[PDB]
């Protein structure tokens, strides 16, 4: 879990206007930045002898 | 031979050998490994991932 307080914020709300739907989130002052990079991939392999 | 005294004698030998040898060895080995990995930074969490 988190070893520190992650709810406190310093001053003017820093917007996090991104995501799948239309909703506005907040970024705490403890975190420098929180991007919403929705990457996705997979892998496969086959071995025979 | 006989001379009128007779002496008798007779011999006949026969030998035969039949030898045979055969060897067969067959080896067949096949190995194939194919790996396909695709990294896609498209921007879809579930649908893009699939």
Order of H and E elements of chain B = E
Instruction: Give the overall form of chain A.
Output: elongated
* Largest interface chains and counts: A-B, 14 and 20 residues
Structural class of chain B: mainly beta
Question: In whole angstroms, how far apart are the ends of chain B?
Answer: 111 Å
- The tally of beta strands of chain A, per DSSP, is 1
Give the oligomeric state of the chains in this entry, treating copies of one chain as homo and distinct chains as hetero. Answer: part of a larger assembly
Report the count of strand segments of chain B: 1
Classify the beta-strand content of chain B into a percent band: 5-15%
Write the element-wise H/E pattern of chain A from the N-terminal end onward.
Answer: E
How helical, in percent, are the residues of chain A? under 10%
Distance between the termini of chain A: 45 Å
Tally of helical segments of chain A: 0
**What does the largest sheet of chain A look like?**
none
Radius of gyration of chain A: 18 Å
Please give the count of helices of chain B.
0
Helix percent band of chain B: under 10%
Round the Cα radius of gyration of chain B to an integer and report it.
44 Å
Query: Which class do the helix and strand fractions of chain A yield?
Result: mainly beta
Strand content of chain A: 5-15%
> Which term fits the overall shape of chain B?
rod-shaped
Furnish the topology, listing elements before pairings.
This is part of a larger assembly, with chains A (49 residues) and B (50 residues).
Chain A: E1 42-48
Chain B: E1 32-38
PDB class: immune system
Keywords: C5b9, immune system
Entry title: Closed conformation of the Membrane Attack Complex
């Amino acid at each position: 879990s988190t070893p520190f307080d992650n709810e406190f914020y310093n001053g003017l709300c820093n917007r996090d206007r991104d995501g799948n739907t239309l909703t506005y989130y907040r970024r705490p002052w403890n975190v420098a930045s929180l991007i919403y990079e929705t990457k996705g991939e997979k892998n496969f392999r086959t071995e025979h002898y | 031979y006989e001379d009128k005294i007779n002496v008798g004698g007779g011999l006949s030998g026969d030998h035969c050998k039949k030898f045979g040898g055969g060897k067969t060895e067959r080896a067949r080995k096949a190995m194939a490994v194919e790996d396909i990995i695709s990294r896609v930074r498209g921007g879809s969490s579930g649908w893009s991932g699939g």
